[PDB]
Amino acid sequence: PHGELQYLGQIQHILRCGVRKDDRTGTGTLSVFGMQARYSLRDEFPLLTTKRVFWKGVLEELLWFIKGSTNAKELSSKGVLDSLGFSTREEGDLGPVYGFQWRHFGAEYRDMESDYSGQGVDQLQRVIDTIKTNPDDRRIIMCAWNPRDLPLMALPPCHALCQFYVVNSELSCQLYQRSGDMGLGVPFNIASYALLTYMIAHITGLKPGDFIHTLGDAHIYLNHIEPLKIQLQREPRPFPKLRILRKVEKIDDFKAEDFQIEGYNPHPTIKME
Ligand SMILES: O=c1c(O)cccc2cc(O)c(O)c(O)c12
């Protein structure tokens, strides 16, 4: 039985048992606390089939993140409350934000054109190195922050924690998100971290295993209920495959054309606010 049925069952559960709760901007959601789903990565790829998921932008944004870019324009050229500073956000400089954290966590930030080699902890290279040096390690963990939180406090809570896990030649990944937007973010995140798992697995000589997605505040924005009610009447189709087209060595060497989705036949796009 389909992994996508988990996602559908969770939409249904929120629209049946979710309670009203407002987000940051006093905007309204249906919310349930604590959920999880598992998607096999073995000989398939969890790109949701009940609406067409924007795969090329999942890929391109992950590449931007892997590059550690803080330049909005290095992504914008793919067509895909955070504020401080006049000349710099005209520029497109986002500050020490997003992928900066995966590749240079904790480095004093200069500008977006600066050279940061060997500055701060490279969480991502560290995960890859640990998988190679000690596959049993229970600490293969990479965190991400909402940029808005960084200036806001000391020891600010992560938005996402990712933990990899190896047994019997299989690479699994668990993504824990302190909140998840079920209509828009969640399918995008499932594909994004399954893609990352496929990349790490490839450069470390392992086979992808499971992607496990865990949420704290799983929620549906009031304005997505109706389109989601309609998405629920669609029957999932077999997940596609992801194929890597070249042999790749190092996680920074990956390019968009290294990747090819196969047998992807989704139901039409659903637009949600
Ligand atoms: O300071 C931290 C920080 O500002 C961000 C949030 C979580 C962290 C987690 C750590 O394990 C670590 O060694 C840290 O320095 C932090």
Swiss-Prot record:
Its EC number is 2.1.1.45. Keywords: Cytoplasm, Disease variant, Dyskeratosis congenita, Isopeptide bond, Membrane, Methyltransferase, Mitochondrion, Mitochondrion inner membrane, Nucleotide biosynthesis, Nucleus, Phosphoprotein, Transferase, Ubl conjugation. Its main location: nucleus. GO terms for molecular function: folic acid binding; mRNA regulatory element binding translation repressor activity; sequence-specific mRNA binding; thymidylate synthase activity. Changing Q123H: In DKCD; uncertain significance. DUMP binds at R24, R138, R139, C158, H159, R178, S179, G180, D181, N189, H219, I220, Y221. There is a cross-link at K250, K255, K271 (Glycyl lysine isopeptide (Lys-Gly) (interchain with G-Cter in SUMO2)). (6R)-5,10-methylene-5,6,7,8-tetrahydrofolate binds at D181. Pathway: Pyrimidine metabolism; dTTP biosynthesis. It catalyses: dUMP + (6R)-5,10-methylene-5,6,7,8-tetrahydrofolate = 7,8-dihydrofolate + dTMP. GO terms for biological process: DNA biosynthetic process; dTMP biosynthetic process; dTTP biosynthetic process; methylation; negative regulation of translation; tetrahydrofolate interconversion. It is an enzyme of class 2 (transferase). GO terms for cellular component: cytoplasm; cytosol; mitochondrial inner membrane; mitochondrial matrix; mitochondrion; nucleus. It is found in: Nucleus; Cytoplasm; Mitochondrion; Mitochondrion matrix. Changing E61K: In DKCD; uncertain significance. InterPro entries: Thymidate_synth/dCMP_Mease, Thymidate_synth/dCMP_Mease_dom, Thymidate_synth/dCMP_Mease_sf, Thymidylate_synthase, Thymidylate_synthase_AS. It is linked to Dyskeratosis congenita, digenic: A form of dyskeratosis congenita, a rare multisystem disorder caused by defective telomere maintenance. It is characterized by progressive bone marrow failure, and the clinical triad of reticulated skin hyperpigmentation, nail dystrophy, and mucosal leukoplakia. Common but variable features include premature graying, aplastic anemia, low platelets, osteoporosis, pulmonary fibrosis, and liver fibrosis among others. Early mortality is often associated with bone marrow failure, infections, fatal pulmonary complications, or malignancy. Catalyzes the reductive methylation of 2'-deoxyuridine 5'-monophosphate (dUMP) to thymidine 5'-monophosphate (dTMP), using the cosubstrate, 5,10- methylenetetrahydrofolate (CH2H4folate) as a 1-carbon donor and reductant and contributes to the de novo mitochondrial thymidylate biosynthesis pathway. PANTHER family: THYMIDYLATE SYNTHASE, THYMIDYLATE SYNTHASE 1. Belongs to the thymidylate synthase family. This is Thymidylate synthase. It comes from Homo sapiens (Human).
